[PDB]
Amino acid sequence: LVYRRFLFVVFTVLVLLPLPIVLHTKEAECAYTLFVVATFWLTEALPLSVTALLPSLMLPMFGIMPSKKVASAYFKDFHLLLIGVICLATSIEKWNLHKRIALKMVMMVGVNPAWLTLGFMSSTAFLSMWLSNTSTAAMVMPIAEAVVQQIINAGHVTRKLTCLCIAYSSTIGGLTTITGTSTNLIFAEYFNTRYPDCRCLNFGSWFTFSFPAALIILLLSWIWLQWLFLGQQKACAEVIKQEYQKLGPIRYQEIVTLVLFIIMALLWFSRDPGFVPGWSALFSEYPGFATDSTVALLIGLLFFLIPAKTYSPLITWKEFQSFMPWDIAILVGGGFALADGCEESGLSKWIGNKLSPLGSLPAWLIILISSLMVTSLTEVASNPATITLFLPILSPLAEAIHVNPLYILIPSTLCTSFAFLLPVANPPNAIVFSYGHLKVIDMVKAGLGVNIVGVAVVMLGICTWIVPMFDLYTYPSWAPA
Amino acid sequence: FSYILVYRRFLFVVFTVLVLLPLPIVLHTKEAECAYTLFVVATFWLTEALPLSVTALLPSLMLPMFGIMPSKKVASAYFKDFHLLLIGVICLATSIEKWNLHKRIALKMVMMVGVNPAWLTLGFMSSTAFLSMWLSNTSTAAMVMPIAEAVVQQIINAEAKGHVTRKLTCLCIAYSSTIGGLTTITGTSTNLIFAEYFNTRYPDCRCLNFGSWFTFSFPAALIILLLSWIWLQWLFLGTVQQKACAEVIKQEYQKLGPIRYQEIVTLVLFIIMALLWFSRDPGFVPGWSALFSEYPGFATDSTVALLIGLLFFLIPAKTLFDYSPLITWKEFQSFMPWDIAILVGGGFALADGCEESGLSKWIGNKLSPLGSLPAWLIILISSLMVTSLTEVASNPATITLFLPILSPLAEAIHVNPLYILIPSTLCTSFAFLLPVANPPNAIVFSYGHLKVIDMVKAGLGVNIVGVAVVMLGICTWIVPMFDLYTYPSWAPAM
């Protein structure tokens, strides 16, 4: 009768019951670690960064990769950019610059009940474009829970609509940049490998197809969240001025931070694609040496040096490592170690030639079902796990049926970020679920209607303006047969 | 005038960056740019102008900007097999502090040995160096240190001088774990690389084995240990009150109570990890590596650390209507030093940059035109160059570079090719100044008791003692052993 107490002790031993690997050679040994980590990632029977250290344990014990080969995959070029942007987000949050450019988009728009939760949507949609959406949901949500605390002192539907609009617009602003969330970053890191002579994916070629795709989302989702819930005021227009004059003039530590933000954003836009010759032609002797991560490290290391107050820098190391997520680094490294182990074992050739019967359907239905299943699966598991487990599976599916790899991997890396419904493994509707509002069914009913319009504009996006961009009907010389 | 004095570590960084800028732009070669990258970074911790994990991120910034190695390759040097061992062995260290396993081993050691400062820093050195001749150096320094820090903290807390006695126990463990690894072949990774290179370069020799390495390296290491103890203990701190400090320890040990369930499991796993570390490949007996002798060198000591360190996240500790594990992982993220993983990775990246650019070959091949010298002087030049080069690169990378440079040099000048290779292998392990050169030097740097000037000032004397004892041994008691004065028959005649 005591089995329900120690519940994920007796469940975590499925090291024993699926063990049909003493019968097969090498690829079932790699498809044993793939099932175990997926079972521990879906149900979350472990702290979710402990399972990422499991490919560093049994892949040397099976004889697939050496232990110094697995350890090299735990720190890729994503981690330098992750250090560089969290060096900026520490100084944005510490010197209260996020409150400066969130109470400014409100009071510029009106305080009407239709336009207030459009400025609330567009503040975090511009904040999450550069930082991570887990960071920007932790900054905007404490502000707007205090603004509506004031607007009722000058009911329940308005506060819950504001609670879900931030958590939706944070994941809406998670795309339009590779650096906006971890999903597009690990997709770009997986795309730099496995397709070496392909030169089509950069920061300029990412903003072009994704900024029309997620601004129509923001304007078609606000109508859906307004229709579902909502259909004297000079004092409430003054109660926002109550805080914007409580904060004094703009300080030196905020001018330096926004200047270093604008300078960091003007780079990544001037190592351009074919439109403009950029500063990457200054280093013409070495084409792929200085990446987007060396820009983040050049700017983010200036926060440890520039004086702020008596000296003491803008940020210190003790308040930096108290801000950086050291779980996401280990989790992404463990995903890359398992993705690199399915290649050195021959599993992602067996999945590629066992799914060649699937290339008899039309090519749009394949990406439709591979986006629908990754959208239905990501509502219960973590988002850097659902796209982790599927990218070494969908990629040999493209190379075997003569379909472009960006034809399949692009609508599958954006639809996996459409996590609007169950708050069991989601950040932004995790942070917003820490308050005592926003019941479960009211999130699901507002989330499936925005998931429909999220999938529909991606399905009309890849059929109108991306097929003349990445040449997705004319399967290239790279990734051969 | 005081504005120059208060902002002195802002003007110093931007002064020493711009004053050395003619060196990579007048000299356009990659050795000059890598020497600029080395001299700028190594000055930034020796003066300690920036935090040490911020200066370690500078190889990830200017090595792609000079054109030495791409960002995808310089990012793959910030995580090696040391980091899996560091992740695994700290899960044990997180759990022995939470359930107070230390202050039960510590308070029992204190009230069975006594409060004596000079004779406690000899028992900490003679036990670390005896444990390090069977285990790894990094594996030894990670186990003795959380117990010894608790021992001296319980000795300090029984006062009812303390800051300077905390650097002693860091340095005398981080140095003894290194000195004790010279006595055996398998005790460190420099001796194994040298023994596998010497046997494939010079067959028909049959000389280097267990017992033959012990009878020239243990009397050398014992004198280095006995003199480093006197040097370190003089450098820092050269019975009515006493028996009252023996009652505080007794009354603090009795208020622990009986040993609980959560201490027994971590005590058992501490023994199991040290038993699996010893029996992997002890050399004289085949270990459990023979079970995997079709994938050789695949499972290292980091696999053993991970396999037992991830068992703390699973084993139940307290009921709730769930259970609770032993470590809960949020107590792990606060306990784990994340500044040391970047400091060791930035040191690995510099060592890879000096190999990719060609500065290490440039330094090594300037030893070739020194053939027209007496034989004891080329030994002293090569051993000094090796001790200088091991302070910025790792020890398995320095001996790998310097063996194919010193081994043909010894055969051209009609010298036995063990008279040159033995003192250059033992001097490769003498990494004592910086915490980026030796991985045991970074374990004791994870506790915050030291500056790096205290490391440099104390490891400068141990380096001189170690070079002098090696040069004493290369002329006495080793000369009759390996016959280092006649040109042998397993060496080529021409």
Side-chain angles (χ1 to χ4, degrees):
Chain A
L1 285 81
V2 295
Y3 313 110
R4 219 58 190 175
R5 287 93 168 162
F6 319 108
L7 187 60
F8 50 93
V9 164
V10 294
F11 183 74
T12 319
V13 282
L14 72 156
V15 181
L16 298 174
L17 180 64
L19 200 47
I21 75 183
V22 305
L23 316 176
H24 304 288
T25 60
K26 191 56 73 200
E27 312 152 350
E29 291 177 350
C30 194
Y32 162 78
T33 78
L34 184 81
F35 297 154
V36 157
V37 170
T39 316
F40 292 158
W41 271 347
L42 286 160
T43 47
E44 199 194 319
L46 273 183
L48 193 68
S49 297
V50 189
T51 83
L53 298 169
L54 259 64
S56 64
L57 173 62
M58 40 193 168
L59 289 189
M61 283 194 77
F62 282 137
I64 300 177
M65 291 165 56
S67 163
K68 61 178 66 171
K69 259 283 173 292
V70 191
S72 67
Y74 271 86
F75 201 88
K76 299 271 188 184
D77 205 4
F78 151 78
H79 297 253
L80 306 174
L81 192 147
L82 194 74
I83 289 176
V85 300
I86 295 172
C87 278
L88 165 70
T90 311
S91 178
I92 281 180
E93 187 258 331
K94 173 185 180 178
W95 301 108
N96 295 123
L97 191 146
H98 59 276
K99 276 194 58 185
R100 190 61 65 110
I101 54 180
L103 301 183
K104 176 58 74 178
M105 312 192 149
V106 189
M107 177 186 166
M108 269 203 298
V109 303
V111 289
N112 293 317
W115 304 112
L116 179 62
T117 168
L118 168 60
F120 277 158
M121 297 198 78
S122 296
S123 81
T124 174
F126 194 78
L127 268 164
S128 180
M129 198 168 145
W130 314 101
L131 323 170
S132 179
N133 42 24
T134 318
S135 178
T136 57
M139 284 204 289
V140 176
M141 186 54 196
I143 308 166
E145 69 94 20
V147 184
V148 195
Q149 182 66 43
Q150 306 149 204
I151 203 165
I152 66 155
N153 296 7
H156 194 62
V157 179
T158 295
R159 295 183 71 187
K160 71 179 169 185
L161 170 65
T162 305
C163 187
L164 54 83
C165 278
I166 288 176
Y168 285 176
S169 193
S170 297
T171 77
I172 284 165
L175 62 152
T176 67
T177 44
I178 54 170
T179 75
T181 188
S182 64
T183 298
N184 316 106
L185 263 161
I186 64 172
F187 160 69
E189 191 75 30
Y190 185 80
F191 196 74
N192 286 118
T193 62
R194 195 79 142 82
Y195 304 106
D197 52 352
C198 165
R199 183 72 271 171
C200 292
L201 195 81
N202 44 61
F203 200 91
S205 67
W206 191 264
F207 179 74
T208 306
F209 77 101
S210 279
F211 189 68
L215 186 61
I216 308 173
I217 284 179
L218 198 82
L219 292 175
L220 281 175
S221 67
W222 165 66
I223 306 290
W224 166 245
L225 301 179
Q226 200 81 10
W227 169 264
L228 208 64
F229 293 106
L230 273 299
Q232 181 180 2
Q233 291 182 356
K234 192 259 287 182
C236 71
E238 189 39 66
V239 82
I240 279 94
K241 294 176 71 70
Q242 183 66 40
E243 283 87 30
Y244 210 67
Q245 266 95 359
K246 184 169 71 174
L247 312 176
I250 181 164
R251 302 184 307 181
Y252 173 73
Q253 295 91 24
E254 281 165 56
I255 293 179
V256 171
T257 310
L258 64 88
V259 159
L260 289 187
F261 172 78
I262 292 163
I263 286 175
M264 194 162 152
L266 281 183
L267 324 168
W268 304 327
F269 266 112
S270 51
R271 39 189 314 274
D272 266 325
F275 285 162
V276 178
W279 59 255
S280 68
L282 257 60
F283 308 96
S284 177
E285 304 282 29
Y286 317 106
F289 273 49
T291 58
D292 282 326
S293 287
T294 71
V295 162
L297 286 175
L298 193 147
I299 299 297
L301 285 182
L302 288 183
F303 291 89
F304 292 105
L305 178 72
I306 288 169
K309 275 174 182 179
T310 298
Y311 73 98
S312 181
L314 283 171
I315 60 174
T316 81
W317 180 263
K318 303 309 161 215
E319 59 202 5
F320 163 74
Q321 66 166 346
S322 178
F323 204 86
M324 183 164 178
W326 300 103
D327 40 354
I328 306 182
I330 304 294
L331 170 62
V332 159
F336 282 143
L338 197 63
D340 293 7
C342 287
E343 183 67 28
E344 295 292 327
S345 174
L347 182 61
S348 285
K349 186 181 284 188
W350 193 74
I351 312 179
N353 300 88
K354 277 301 163 299
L355 258 67
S356 290
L358 216 60
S360 179
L361 303 180
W364 56 271
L365 196 147
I366 302 300
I367 68 166
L368 190 62
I369 64 162
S370 71
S371 295
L372 275 173
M373 71 157 58
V374 79
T375 305
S376 296
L377 186 63
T378 190
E379 319 291 337
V380 298
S382 179
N383 301 150
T386 72
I387 196 63
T388 289
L389 293 169
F390 262 91
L391 287 176
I393 300 181
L394 281 178
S395 297
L397 175 57
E399 305 168 7
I401 67 184
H402 281 309
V403 163
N404 195 289
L406 284 178
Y407 195 80
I408 301 186
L409 294 192
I410 282 297
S412 301
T413 190
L414 289 183
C415 274
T416 181
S417 88
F418 291 157
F420 307 108
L421 2 43
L422 263 340
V424 165
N426 184 229
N429 344 353
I431 301 181
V432 308
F433 201 65
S434 296
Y435 303 98
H437 314 274
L438 212 54
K439 298 292 183 182
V440 169
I441 188 167
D442 287 335
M443 182 184 296
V444 173
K445 184 66 177 177
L448 87 165
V450 74
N451 223 341
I452 285 181
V453 74
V455 175
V457 304
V458 172
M459 273 309 297
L460 64 90
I462 207 172
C463 84
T464 53
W465 81 82
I466 316 170
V467 284
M469 181 177 177
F470 282 103
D471 194 35
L472 304 152
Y473 291 150
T474 312
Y475 168 76
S477 296
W478 65 83
Chain B
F1 200 79
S2 65
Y3 291 96
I4 301 99
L5 192 65
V6 61
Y7 299 116
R8 58 184 187 186
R9 67 167 179 89
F10 178 76
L11 308 182
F12 172 69
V13 164
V14 313
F15 167 67
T16 192
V17 159
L18 274 72
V19 77
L20 311 180
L21 263 178
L23 178 74
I25 69 171
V26 174
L27 266 68
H28 195 74
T29 78
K30 303 297 176 188
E31 293 88 3
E33 307 173 352
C34 187
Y36 174 82
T37 311
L38 173 70
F39 288 156
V40 158
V41 167
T43 317
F44 276 162
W45 50 65
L46 280 182
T47 65
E48 219 163 353
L50 299 159
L52 308 194
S53 303
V54 172
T55 76
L57 289 169
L58 296 183
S60 57
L61 175 63
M62 58 193 51
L63 284 190
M65 282 188 72
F66 273 126
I68 287 174
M69 58 198 317
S71 297
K72 314 293 214 275
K73 200 156 70 172
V74 79
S76 177
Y78 274 81
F79 214 94
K80 308 225 170 178
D81 218 9
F82 160 76
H83 298 258
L84 300 185
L85 179 83
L86 188 76
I87 282 177
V89 79
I90 282 173
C91 293
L92 179 48
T94 313
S95 183
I96 62 171
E97 184 157 282
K98 181 178 168 42
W99 305 109
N100 285 329
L101 186 55
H102 77 84
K103 314 165 50 190
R104 200 184 285 273
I105 309 181
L107 281 184
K108 198 67 175 191
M109 266 172 78
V110 163
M111 77 188 210
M112 277 201 315
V113 169
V115 281
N116 204 336
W119 275 12
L120 205 73
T121 47
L122 186 58
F124 279 145
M125 293 178 86
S126 301
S127 296
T128 305
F130 177 71
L131 207 56
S132 178
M133 69 171 66
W134 320 117
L135 304 165
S136 167
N137 301 338
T138 308
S139 309
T140 315
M143 302 185 321
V144 193
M145 189 63 206
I147 283 92
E149 177 48 53
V151 164
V152 291
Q153 190 60 42
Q154 286 307 309
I155 283 186
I156 283 166
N157 290 4
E159 299 292 334
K161 200 257 180 184
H163 179 48
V164 71
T165 191
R166 275 168 176 154
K167 310 183 195 56
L168 281 171
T169 75
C170 295
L171 295 176
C172 88
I173 284 178
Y175 292 167
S176 298
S177 179
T178 315
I179 294 157
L182 315 172
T183 67
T184 53
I185 284 171
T186 320
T188 185
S189 44
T190 309
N191 304 3
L192 185 64
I193 287 179
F194 166 66
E196 66 93 19
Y197 178 76
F198 185 81
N199 289 297
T200 192
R201 182 84 138 84
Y202 305 95
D204 275 27
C205 189
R206 312 286 299 271
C207 291
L208 296 183
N209 65 101
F210 205 99
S212 161
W213 192 274
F214 183 73
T215 185
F216 85 95
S217 195
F218 171 72
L222 194 51
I223 307 173
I224 294 168
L225 200 67
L226 288 171
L227 292 173
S228 312
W229 166 60
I230 304 172
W231 162 252
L232 281 168
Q233 207 258 333
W234 174 89
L235 188 68
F236 288 102
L237 46 94
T239 61
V240 195
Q241 177 205 139
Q242 202 282 297
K243 72 184 290 184
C245 294
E247 199 264 329
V248 186
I249 300 292
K250 190 87 65 174
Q251 215 75 27
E252 177 50 45
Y253 188 71
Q254 292 178 171
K255 72 155 60 77
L256 287 173
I259 174 154
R260 39 189 173 181
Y261 158 73
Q262 287 90 18
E263 303 195 28
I264 299 168
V265 185
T266 74
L267 183 70
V268 159
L269 291 180
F270 187 85
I271 296 164
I272 287 178
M273 200 195 283
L275 278 167
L276 283 177
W277 270 343
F278 173 72
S279 47
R280 178 187 59 84
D281 183 37
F284 44 86
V285 168
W288 54 257
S289 298
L291 308 180
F292 307 104
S293 46
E294 51 189 357
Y295 321 104
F298 270 47
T300 75
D301 283 359
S302 297
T303 308
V304 172
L306 282 172
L307 175 64
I308 300 180
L310 295 190
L311 266 185
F312 291 100
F313 301 92
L314 263 171
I315 294 173
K318 285 181 181 179
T319 57
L320 265 76
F321 201 69
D322 218 346
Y323 77 96
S324 178
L326 275 167
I327 190 171
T328 316
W329 191 91
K330 201 155 76 177
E331 316 158 346
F332 171 76
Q333 206 203 11
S334 83
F335 199 88
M336 167 90 168
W338 299 107
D339 46 346
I340 306 299
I342 309 191
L343 180 70
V344 176
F348 281 146
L350 259 183
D352 289 331
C354 304
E355 202 72 65
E356 186 67 29
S357 60
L359 183 58
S360 295
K361 298 293 182 183
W362 166 264
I363 293 178
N365 293 26
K366 292 232 303 171
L367 204 42
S368 297
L370 282 193
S372 296
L373 278 188
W376 64 272
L377 191 48
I378 319 167
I379 290 174
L380 190 52
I381 288 305
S382 316
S383 297
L384 276 170
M385 191 183 310
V386 156
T387 54
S388 67
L389 260 293
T390 193
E391 297 295 330
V392 290
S394 72
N395 304 349
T398 310
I399 193 66
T400 309
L401 159 74
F402 266 104
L403 276 167
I405 313 176
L406 287 160
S407 59
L409 158 71
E411 311 165 8
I413 58 179
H414 210 74
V415 164
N416 194 293
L418 263 183
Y419 191 38
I420 322 288
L421 295 184
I422 277 178
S424 302
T425 314
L426 289 178
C427 282
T428 316
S429 298
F430 290 159
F432 296 137
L433 303 184
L434 291 177
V436 310
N438 219 4
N441 294 9
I443 308 297
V444 311
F445 216 80
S446 300
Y447 288 82
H449 304 321
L450 279 157
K451 301 300 176 290
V452 69
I453 191 53
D454 299 329
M455 284 207 66
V456 164
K457 200 202 313 298
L460 197 58
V462 185
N463 261 316
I464 296 175
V465 165
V467 168
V469 168
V470 157
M471 290 302 296
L472 160 73
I474 204 62
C475 296
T476 304
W477 87 76
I478 298 179
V479 179
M481 263 188 42
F482 290 125
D483 214 42
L484 293 187
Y485 277 7
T486 70
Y487 196 53
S489 54
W490 42 268
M494 184 63 73

